[model samples]
Target chain A: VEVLEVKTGVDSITEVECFLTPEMGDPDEHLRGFSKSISISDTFESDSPNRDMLPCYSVARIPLPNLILMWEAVTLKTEVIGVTSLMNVHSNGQATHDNGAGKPVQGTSFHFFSVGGEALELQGVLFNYRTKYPDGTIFPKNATVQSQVMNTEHKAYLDKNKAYPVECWVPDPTRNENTRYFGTLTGGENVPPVLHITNTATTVLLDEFGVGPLCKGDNLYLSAVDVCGMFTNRSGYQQWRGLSRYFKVQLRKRRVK
Target chain B: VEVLEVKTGVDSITEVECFLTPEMGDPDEHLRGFSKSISISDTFESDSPNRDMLPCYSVARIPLPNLNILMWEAVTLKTEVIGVTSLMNVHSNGQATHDNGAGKPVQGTSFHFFSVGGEALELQGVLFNYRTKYPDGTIFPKNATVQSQVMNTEHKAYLDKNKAYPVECWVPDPTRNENTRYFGTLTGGENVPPVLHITNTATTVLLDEFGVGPLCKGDNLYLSAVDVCGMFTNRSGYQQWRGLSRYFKVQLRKRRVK
Candidate 1:
C-alpha cells in the first residue's frame, strides 16, 4: 500500500555470481562427462573410480574484489544448473522397456557448497582404497586404510590450481569449523528422492549468531558438489550423471581492522 | 544467565485458524482428486496429459479481523495436512506392488507444494507438453519455447483463482514470490517409495529475513496449496496421482507498522 526505502537492516551489500563446472571425468583423455557410457558397471560393493570410470567433485575458488577490507557473506542464492536434463528419459536407452516403468536416476545425491576463510580442511571417504586420484587434488593421504566407509578427519586443501581428484574419494565434512558450509544428502534406495528443483535460486541466510566465513585473505572460496544421481535405462541398466551448479553470494562490507 | 519474556513482547496477540479443503478435481465432472490414471511416457514432449489426469490448485483467501492499520504482522504458523494418514489405505485403492499382496500405495513422482502469503501466490510455467491443450475455466501459459521444459520461462501469474490451476503447467515463482513463504518438492520417476509424515505436533514460525512473517496487504491472508501426493500404482502397473488436504493456523500481533 505504500513505498518506503527501508535500510534493508544493513548497508553496502554486494553480490558475486559464478558457476562451477562439473568435474565429472577426465577431459584430458577426451573422456568428457564421465566416459565408459557403454558398460558402466553399476557396482556398489566398495568400488573406487579409475580412469575407466571416473566421477569427481565440482569446486571453484572465487577471488573477491578489494573494494572492502573484509566481506561478510550474509545471503546465498544457489541452484543446480541444467536440472531439466533429467527429463530426457528417452535417450541412451528407453526409460521403460518391459512391463514396468523404469525409474529415473534418483540415487544417492550429495549437494553442498561453502564460503570459507582459508583452504577448507576437507575429510575424505573412498569407495575402494586402491583407486588413484588426479595429481593436484588434495586429500589426507593414507586416510582410507580403515574401510573406505566411514568419515575421518583426514585434512586436505581444496586447491584451485589442482586438476581436482578422482571420483571415488568424496568430502567427509569434518574439522572445518571456521568455514560456513551447507551439505545435504537426499535419496536412499527405498525412498524416492524428494528434492525440489526450482528456477528461482535457493536463498540461504545466516542464522542468528550464524557466523560468517570471514574472508581473511580477501579470498572467497566457492565449493560445490552436485551428484544429480544416476540414470536408469530400459533394461534397468544404470549410468551416473551429474549437473553443474550456480552460486551467487551476497555479502556486506566489514572492517577487519 | 537470565531469560525474560513478556507475552513474546507484544501488547495484544491473536490467532486465526482454518482448514483448507483440497480443491483437487471437478466434482461436477465426476472427477474427485482426478479421473483416469496417466501414462508414463518416455520424453517430456511425448507425454501429454489428459484433462482428467491433472490436479487443480487448492487455495483459500482468509480474511483477518481488522487491526494494525492496513496490514497484520504475522508472528508464527501452525500447519498440518488433514487426513494425511488416509494415504495408508493401500489395500483396495489399486493393484498391489505384487499380485494378491498389499496394493502399491501412493509413492514417488510427487509434487507437494504449499504457500502462505498476504496476496495471491505468484506462478511460473514449465510445460510437460507444450502442444498439449489446457481446458477452459483455468488460466495457463501460452507460447512454447525451446527451454520451457528444462528452465523456467518468464511467464508469471497469481494463484487468485482456486481449483482451476493445472499443477503440472505452473509452479510458485521462486524469484518474485518473496511476500509469500512457499516450499515444495517434485520427486520420483518410477515406483520409488514415497514418504509422507503428518502430525498435529508440527509447526513453523512465519518469520522472514527481517525477522517477521508475511505482512498482510488488507487483512487478507492468502493460503494457497498444491499437494500432488505422488502416484498410486495398481497390480497391472496403472498409476494415478493422489491429493491431500492441510490445516493452517497463523498467530498475529499488533505492531506499529503504520
Candidate 2:
C-alpha cells in the first residue's frame, strides 16, 4: 500500500522521497543511499508445501529512484558511457545528479565483458519505474538487513530493496538504502536460470570501477534488474525465491607492486 | 530546388525521405552503397588554393538528400581497422533486403575496433540504440542518416556541427561530404581517433578472410558514394570538401621466425 520507490522506465527516474517506519527497522542503522552489494532469498505462500527461505547470491538489477547526492569534486567520479547507462561515485541522497543525457554517456551500460580482460562493469544507473510520482521524481521505500555474505568489508546492507553486509570496517550500521542485484551468470542454463561467462570474449561488464583492491578475492559482481518490474527483497535472504540471488564467487586478488 | 537537404531555425520534420544517385567512375563500376569507405577533400569551400582532393572517410549520420539505397545495420565489418567512438549494434535490418521483416538471416552491422593491444574484436548486435528500427515491421526511411560526425581522426580540428553521416553507403559524390571523416574518440587528451584496420594481425601483406587486404600500394582506389551523406571524391580529388584524414595504418609487424 505504501509506495517506497518509483521507476520511470528509461535508465532514469523522476522522483524519490524516503520515509521509514520504526516497526520495519531502525533509522539509525541506514546507509545514506550508497549500497553496492545485496543478498537475495526466495519466498512462497506461508501455507505452500515447500514454504522456505532460499538465500541466493547472484546478479540483480537495482533501480535507484531519483536521488543524486553531491560530493566533493575530489571524491566524485561520474561517467555516462552511453545513452542508457549512468555511473557515478558520490554520496547518495534525493537531489537529481545529472543523468548525462544527450551527452555521449547515454549509450553505455553494465558490460558483462569489455576490451580489457575485465568482468562485470556497472555502466549505467537504472531507475525504478513502478512507483514514480507524476512530476518525474521517484519515491524510495527501502529496508536494510544485516549481511555477512558478500562484500563483507562494507558493513550491513544499506539498500532499500535488499540487505547489506555487517562487517564493513566503519560498520555504518547506522545507514540504510534500497539495493537491488540482477541475477547471475552462474545459473543461466537452469529452468530457474543464471548466467555463465563461458565465452570470455563476448561477455561485457558495465561496472563503476575496474575490479580494484576492495573487490579482491571475489567474483566480479553486478545487477541487471529492469525498472519496469517490481521485485523487492527486504528480509534476510533465503534460497529459492524468484528475486533471490543465484551466483557465488571465490576471488584471489593479485598484489600490485 | 526540392530541398536536397535543408536546415532551418525551426524546420521541424521527423520522418524525411530522399533519392540517391550513384557515381559513374567507380572501379567496380557498380552501385556500391556508400557504406564502405569513401574520400572527402580537405578544402573547406573546395576553392582554387588546395584544388587537390584531401583524404576523408564516410559515416551514416548526414542525410543523403539525393540517394535512397539501403537501411543501416548496427554492425559492419570493415576490410580495415576503423576508429570509432561509443557505438551500438542491433540484431537485424528488418526490411532493407526485402519487405519481409520476419525472414531469417536477420542482417545486422558488425562493429570492429582494435583493442588497447591492437587486437580486433567485433561488438555484435549487443546494444539496442544503434539502429533506427528494431524487433520488426517498420520502415526506417532510406534517406535518413543515423549518425553524425562530431569528431574526426585529426585532433586539431574541432567538431563542426555542419556535417552529418547517413547509414547507407553513398554512391554519387557530393562536395560537402568530401573532406568529412567519421567520429572517433574524445578521451585521453591526445584524442586518438579510431581507424579502419585493413591487415591481418599476424601477417603484414596477407588479409584476414573477413578484413581488408594490403593497400594496393600505388594505384588510386575509388570510394563508394552511396552513403547517406551523398559524398564521393572527384577523380582529381581537389573539387569537393567534407572532412580530413592523415592516412594512419594498423599494419601487422611480423617478426623473423629464424
Candidate 3:
C-alpha cells in the first residue's frame, strides 16, 4: 500500500445549522413545537420518574469531516423558537390587566446542547430570570431535575418563597461559583410566551489541551434540551411546552497525524 | 548588553483559568452574595454625579506573562458560574407590598461581560434606563450604540434602585483603538440561557481581518470585566444587583504580524 502525505496548516471554517423539535409527540403535525401537561405533583420529586418520559429533547447525528481528521468548533449560537411573547399588542379591543407584570416574556427556562459520539456529555446551564411572578395562581410554577453538581442551594431559596410569583425574585449574589436559577411564572391567561435567540454568557468549547471534541468513527452527536417550562393559558389551564431550539455551530478541520 | 540569537519557529500557545468573585461588599457575613442598598436618587443621572459612589460591577487586574519578553493575543475563552442551577430554590424572603410582590433572585433577565487590555483603559458609561436618559451636558463616546437586548430606547423603563427590572447594561471600552478589545452580551432570560460546554463550545476570532491583535504595555496585560450576572432582591422587598464568579480561560498565541 502506498502512503499518502498529510496536509496540515490553518484549515478553513464552516458552519452547520439545525432545529431541534421536542421528543414529546406533536399531534398538531407541527414538528417545530411540542407540549406536555404538568401538575403540582411533578414538583415534589427532584428527579421525578416522569421527567425521563417527558422527552428531555431531540437528538440528531450531525455529519462531519472524518474520524481521522480533527475538527475544532469555533463558535455556536442557539435560540428558542415558537414561544410567542405575552407582551403582544392587545388586538380586538382586549382589556389590559395592569398587574405589574412587565411583559409576558420567557424566563426561568433552561436551554442545553452538545456534540460528541455515543453521548454528548458536556455540561453547562443558563438561568434566565431576574424578577419573580406569583406561582400558585396565573403564573407558571418552576422546578428542576437536580443533580450532584446542580445549584440546589439557590433552588431552596426560591422554594422558600414559593408562594410569591417568580417575577419578584433576584439572584443571591453572596453565593460563590454557581449562579444558575429557574422559576415557573409564565404569566397569567392573557400573557403570551416570548421567544428569543441569544448566546450563552459563558464562552469557549475547547478541551484541556485547547482542542475541540473529537468525533470518533466520524459520527457526531448533536443534542439539545429546551426546558422552557410550564405555560398557563388564559383559561387558567397549565401545560408545559418544550419550545423548539435552533443551533448554528462552526467547525474547523485539522490534521490528526 | 549581550545579544542572543533566537530561533524563529512555530509559537506555542498558553491559557489562563481562574474564578472572579464579585467586588460588591461583604461586610456582613450574610452579605456575601448581596450588595449595599442602592440609594433611590443614584438612579436619576446617567452619569449621576453620585455614580462613582454607587458600586459598578466587580473588576480586577489579571497579570499575564511579562510583555518585555513575549506577548500573547487572547484568541479564545470559556466561562460560566460555578453554581448556576442554585437559583432554582431561593425562597427566604416573603412577599412585600412594593413592586407588586415579586420574589428576589436575578432571574428572568440578561447578563453582559467583557475582557480586555493593551492599556490600563478608560471607563465609559452606558445606561439601562431610557427614562433617566443620557446626561445632556456630558460628552459621551462619539460612536456609541446600545444593543437592543440590553436597552431598547423604544421601551421606556425607569431607574429604580429596588425592583430588579429586566433592564441591564455595561461600560464599553472608552478607547476604540485596536489596543482595546471588547465583547458584550445581553443574556435574555425568558428561556434557559444557552448551556455552554467544554467539548462543544463557541470560539470568537479576536484578531481583525488582517490578523492583527493588541500589543501589551509596560510588560503587563490588564484584565477588566463587568459580570452583571443578574439582579437580587433583598428581604425588605428591595431589588439589588447580584453577580457571579466568571471562569475565564483565555488561549494566547504569539502573533505572526509583529
| Candidate models: Cα lDDT each | 0.59, 0.19, 0.40
Which digits, one per residue and each the tens of the lDDT, describe model 1 over residues B1-258? 111221345446778788776654533465466435554555433455444555767788887877523356667777876776777887765765555777767765666667778788887665533445566676777665534433334657788887677776676654566678876666756665556676667677777655666777777888877666665665566555667777788887655553
Highest DockQ model number: 1
Query: How close to the true structure is residue A220 of candidate 2, measured as C-alpha lDDT?
Result: 26
In candidate 1 chain A, where is summed lDDT lowest over 10 consecutive residues?
A1-10
Candidate 2 lDDT by residue in tens digits, B112-202: 1111111111111111111222112211123222111111111122111111222111111111111111222212100112232334343
Count clashing pairs, candidate 1.
6
TM (chain A), candidate 3: 0.51
TM-score of each: 0.68, 0.22, 0.38
Pairwise DockQ winner, candidates 2 and 3: 3
Q: What is the docking quality class of candidate 1?
A: incorrect
Clashing pairs in 1: A55-A167, A105-A230, B95-B234, B95-B235, B96-B103, B109-B188
TM-score for candidate 2 (chain B) = 0.16
How does residue B219 of candidate 2 score in lDDT? Answer: 18
lDDT of residue A75 for candidate 2: 11
Higher-scoring candidate on DockQ, 1 or 3: 1
Residues B1-258, candidate 3: write the lDDT tens digits: 111222245545566677666544343577665444333322212223222112234444556655314555666666555556655445556233256664544543334445555554343233322223322322322233322212222333221121112112223322223464555444433222334233327555555444544555543455544444544545554434455566666666654332
Candidate 1 per-residue lDDT over residues A1-257, each given as its tens digit: 11122223445566777766555553333223332442432555433444333455556667776752566676677655433334323233343323333365567666777766556655666656655443544544665556376646554677653244534344445556556677777766433444664333445545456546666666777777666666555455554555555677887666543
